[PDB]
Design a protein around this ligand. Structure first.
Ligand code: NA
Ligand code: NA
Length: 580
DNA sequence: CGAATTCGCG
DNA sequence: CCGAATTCGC
């Protein structure tokens, strides 16, 4: 089968062409401070494999790596770039990233190596990474001959696949989306990950001790209320205790057995004192195992920072996801969990954390996209959207809106930006579905523009096969035509929701790029640390706070121009917690 | 090792 | 409408 290449033992001029497919291979899943196991270059002059100890010590090669006028095509350039940052080497001039290109063409493909991306264009002369490296325990770097040929075949595939991928992006009007949004974002994310977020480990350990005391006693409480010891963390054992030893009523099931989810438990609370205690235990136990212990496990003892990996090509909506640690689900809603954010601190003395977030970006996008007159006016008035929605669907004045009316209108708003559900709304408010349905319908006569939009987008998904965001991100919806009701329903919701959630994703991505540019133009030391779907988190010298208070919201509000304002709130403080 | 369950965020 | 921790059957 054998692909021919040069197994180079030193860098030559012809390897430094100003157009090349480049592979800088990091086999470790978590690429932070990870080995680079080999390098492949394919250009007009040939195909090359270089050992990294040689390549990365060659001044000419390193200068080439960092020369922006030397264009590279790659796959997961962020992976390579971060790995090089940790070695003090800058990667530049990446003009095409095959992973991001695949992602934009079809985020449902699940492309996670060069092979998977190559298959989209009938190119199969490259092996899947799994086949070469193995899976799980037996994952391993193979001897040099196998390694080098694998990396050269990936480089060769990248070299061949650029043009067909760019052609399709162009036909999709997604060329600018790749070149001007996702790829520049990828460098910014690479900076963010490398910078990391400093963690006060002493505070976490302290909070851990406080948890363990409480846990230890709630645990003991549960045992005497059950008159038995058992694993409270096993939903099956818990199910036996609750529903068999303590003959509690079964109000919901899982397919494996009894449901012990928190929504059920709340309903069981009037029956036995053990239910509130299990609930506490769950709350405290979640914080202990995931946010205390989980977090301390991934803080790097060298930097005392956590270095997340943002997955830029994973979600079907265009959102990022965040791993090891996941910094997009740090507690905020309940106070004792919110206290976790006290452990996230600036990375230097007399710096502060700065957080800015969009207020209701999704509903604002819906207003713009549906051109709903009522919804648009509400935001031009900067109304409380939940109170307005309560006024409208209950046909009452502002003074007549009760907290509970507001809470239900809130829930409809939540559900509306996730494509109603009829039944799902019912679950959230525990009402009946007929009840839930006529809230939904009362919504649609308050907002005929949104109704019209929901109907229009569903027909469009049917006729085209996909739906589109503001900046031309795509999601294919094959199930929109399915004869199975449930399946067809999910697809319909996605058709409604994806232009909403996806356009919000577009906007905050552009904002990140606009921000990064402005900060550098202003020569500020401030830099991005994290993004949480609708929220940007920075750190900077305390001396830069007042400028940032104007700069960051301006950038975020002006990222796109919609038929309604975008509104951004901001706070800063000594810790992430205090930035509220 | 991997399906299932629960819960955290948006 | 994402990811981490845990359990459990294998
Ligand atoms: Na040569
Ligand atoms: Na890479």
């Amino acid at each position: 089968s054998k692909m021919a290449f040069t197994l180079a033992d030193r860098v030559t001029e012809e390897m430094l062409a100003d157009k090349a497919a480049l592979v800088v291979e990091v086999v470790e899943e978590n690429y932070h401070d990870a080995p680079i196991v080999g390098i492949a270059v394919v250009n007009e002059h040939g195909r090359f494999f270089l050992r990294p100890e040689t390549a990365l010590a060659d001044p000419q090669f390193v200068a080439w790596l960092g020369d922006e006028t030397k264009k590279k095509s790659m796959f997961d350039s962020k992976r390579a770039a971060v790995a090089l940052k940790w070695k003090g080497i800058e990667l530049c001039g990446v003009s095409f990233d095959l992973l991001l290109a695949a992602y934009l063409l079809d985020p449902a493909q699940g492309v996670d190596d060069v092979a998977a991306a190559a298959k989209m264009k009938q190119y199969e002369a490259v092996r899947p990474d799994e086949a070469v490296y193995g899976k799980g325990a037996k994952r391993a770097v193979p001897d040099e001959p196998v390694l080098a040929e694998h990396l050269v075949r990936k480089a060769a595939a990248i070299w061949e696949l650029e043009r067909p991928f760019l052609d399709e992006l162009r036909r999709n009007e997604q060329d600018r989306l790749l070149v001007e949004l996702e790829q520049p974002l990828s460098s910014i994310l690479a900076e963010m990950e490398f910078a990391g977020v400093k963690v006060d480990t002493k505070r976490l350990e302290q909070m851990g001790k406080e948890l363990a005391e409480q846990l230890g006693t709630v645990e003991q409480r549960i045992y005497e209320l059950a008159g038995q010891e058992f694993n409270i963390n096993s939903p099956k054992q818990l199910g036996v205790i609750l529903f068999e030893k303590l003959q509690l009523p079964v109000l919901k099931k899982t397919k494996t057995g009894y449901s012990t989810s928190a929504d059920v438990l709340e309903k069981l609370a009037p029956y036995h004192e053990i239910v509130e205690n299990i609930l506490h235990y769950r709350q405290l136990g979640k914080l202990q195992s995931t946010y205390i212990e989980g977090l301390l496990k991934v803080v790097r003892p060298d930097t005392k920072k956590v270095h997340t990996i943002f997955n830029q090509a994973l979600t079907q909506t265009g959102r990022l996801s965040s791993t090891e640690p996941n910094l997009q689900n740090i507690p905020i809603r309940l106070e004792e969990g919110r206290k976790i954010r006290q452990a996230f601190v600036p990375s230097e003395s007399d710096w502060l954390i700065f957080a800015a977030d969009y207020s209701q970006i999704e509903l604002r996008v819906l207003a713009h996209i549906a051109e709903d007159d009522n919804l648009m006016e509400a935001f031009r008035r900067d109304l409380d959207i939940h109170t307005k929605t309560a006024m409208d669907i209950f046909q009452v004045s502002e003074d007549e809106v009760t907290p509970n009316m507001r809470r239900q209108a809130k829930a409809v708003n939540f559900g509306i930006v996730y494509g109603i559900s009829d039944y799902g709304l019912a679950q959230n408010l525990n009402i009946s579905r007929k009840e839930a349905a006529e809230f939904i319908e009362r919504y649609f006569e308050s907002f005929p523009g949104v109704k019209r939009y929901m109907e229009n987008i569903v027909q469009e998904a049917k006729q085209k096969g996909y739906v589109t965001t503001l900046l031309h991100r795509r999601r294919y919806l094959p199930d929109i035509t399915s004869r199975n009701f449930n399946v067809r329903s999910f697809a319909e919701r996605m058709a409604m929701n994806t232009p909403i959630q996806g356009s919000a994703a577009d906007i905050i991505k552009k904002a990140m790029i606009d921000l990064n540019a402005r900060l550098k133009e202003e020569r500020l030391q401030a830099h991005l640390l994290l993004q949480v779907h609708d929220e940007l988190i920075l750190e900077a010298p305390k001396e830069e706070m007042e400028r940032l208070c104007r700069l960051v919201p301006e950038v975020m509000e002006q990222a796109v121009t919609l038929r309604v304002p975008l509104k951004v709130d901001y706070h800063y403080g000594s810790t992430w917690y205090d930035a509220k």
